[PDB]
Every structure is written in C-alpha cells, then in structure tokens.
C-alpha cells in the first residue's frame, strides 16, 4: 500500500494530508494508499479507481473537476509514500498525449509510457523518490499515471496525478 505524495495524486489530494484539495473522493479521503488491482488492469473510465470498490468517485473526468499541481516540462520528481512496504518488481509512468480530451473517460490508449524503473525484487523504503522526464510537447492539463508493480503478488498500485504544465 502506497500513494504518490508529490506531485499529489488525485487520491492523495482527497485526504487531510493532501489538504482536501479534492472533494468527494470516496475511500481516497481516508486510504489513498489502497488502490490495488491486478497488474495490467487498464479499464477505460476506471483508471483513477483501478475499478476498486469505494474509489468510483475518482473516475469522474472533466477539465475542472480535479486539483492540478503546476509543473514544467522536463525533469519531474515523483515521491511515493508507502504505508506498507512490499517487495517491488517495477515502477511505470505514463502521461496523456498532446491533444487528449480532458472531458472524456480516461483510456490508457491515449497515454504514452514515459518512464520505467526496475524494482529489482527488493523492498523499498517508506519514502521513494524518482525523477521522470515530462516530454516537451505537453502543455496545460495532463494526467500522469503512476503504477507500482508488486514483486511477490500479481498486483499493482495505481495513482492518477493531475498536473498543469506551463
């Protein structure tokens, strides 16, 4: 169990630690660390919740529904916090393509992968800091999809992150 704390994930922003910058986020208010589903689950319109019971409110998609972190193109530091550390296979990062539609359900086919970090089947620390590159054809509102793949289970944790690139 874990979440992306910086830039705050959509679920994390639903919690008091995230400043309640998103309202009406279901289970994300209290347990943004709990978005666990099998690896390679990418159901259109169910990316933010990973299809998990109680996280449905996260799946709403409009241009103005969610709080964004202002970022630039180029390097971006990602910080995860793990409430329960697990042996790790992988960390994968995706971002919406230039020209995507922020008022349509999220579809992984409309993202590019932009980073992939091998977990080496080791147990990470409670705070994990990584740096990924935001491509320079992205401007304005985008969604980063951060995926922590567990080493000793068939599952992953899924973190949609709303950013405003300027």
Contacts with Cu ion by CB under 5 A lie at 1, 84
Number of residue whose CB is nearest Cu ion: 1
Contact 54, 24 (CB under 8 A): no
- Nearer to Cu ion by Cβ, of 1 and 65: the residue is 1
| Shortest Å distance, C-beta 1 to Cu ion | 3
| Shortest Å distance, C-beta 89 to Cu ion | 14
Contact 3, 128 (CB under 8 A): no
Q: Is 86 annotated as a binding residue?
A: yes
Contact 11, 32 (CB under 8 A): yes
Contact 106, 45 (CB under 8 A): yes
- Nearer to Cu ion by Cβ, of 73 and 155: the residue is 155
- Nearer to Cu ion by Cβ, of 62 and 84: the residue is 84
Q: Is 1 annotated as a binding residue?
A: yes
- Nearer to Cu ion by Cβ, of 84 and 103: the residue is 84
Provide the residue count of the chain: 166
| Shortest Å distance, C-beta 51 to Cu ion | 17
In the three-class reduction of DSSP (H, G, I as helix; E, B as strand; rest coil), residue 65 is classed as: coil
Check the chain for breaks (C–N over 2.5 Å) and list the residue before each, or none: none
| Shortest Å distance, C-beta 86 to Cu ion | 6
Tell me how far apart the alpha carbons of residues 63 and 79 are, in angstroms, rounded to a whole number.
25
Q: Which residue positions form the known binding site?
A: 1, 86
Q: Which residue positions form the known binding site for Cu cation?
A: 1, 86
């Amino acid at each position: 169990h874990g979440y992306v704390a910086s830039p705050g994930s959509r679920a994390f922003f639903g919690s008091s630690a995230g400043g309640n910058l998103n309202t009406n986020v279901g289970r994300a208010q209290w347990e943004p660390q709990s978005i666990e589903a099998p690896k390679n689950t990418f159901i259109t319109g169910k990316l933010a919740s990973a299809g998990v019971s109680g996280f449905e409110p996260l799946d709403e998609q409009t241009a103005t529904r969610w709080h964004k972190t202002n970022i630039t193109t180029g390097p971006l530091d990602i910080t995860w916090n793990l409430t329960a550390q697990h042996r790790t296979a992988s960390w994968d990062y995706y971002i919406t393509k230039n020209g995507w539609n922020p008022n349509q359900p999220l579809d992984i086919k409309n993202f590019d992968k932009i980073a992939s970090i091998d977990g080496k089947q080791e147990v990470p620390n409670k705070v994990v800091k990584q740096t990924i590159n935001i491509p320079t054809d992205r401007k304005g509102y985008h969604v980063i999809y951060a995926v922590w793949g567990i080493g000793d289970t068939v599952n992953a944790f899924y973190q949609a992150i709303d950013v405003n690139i300027q």
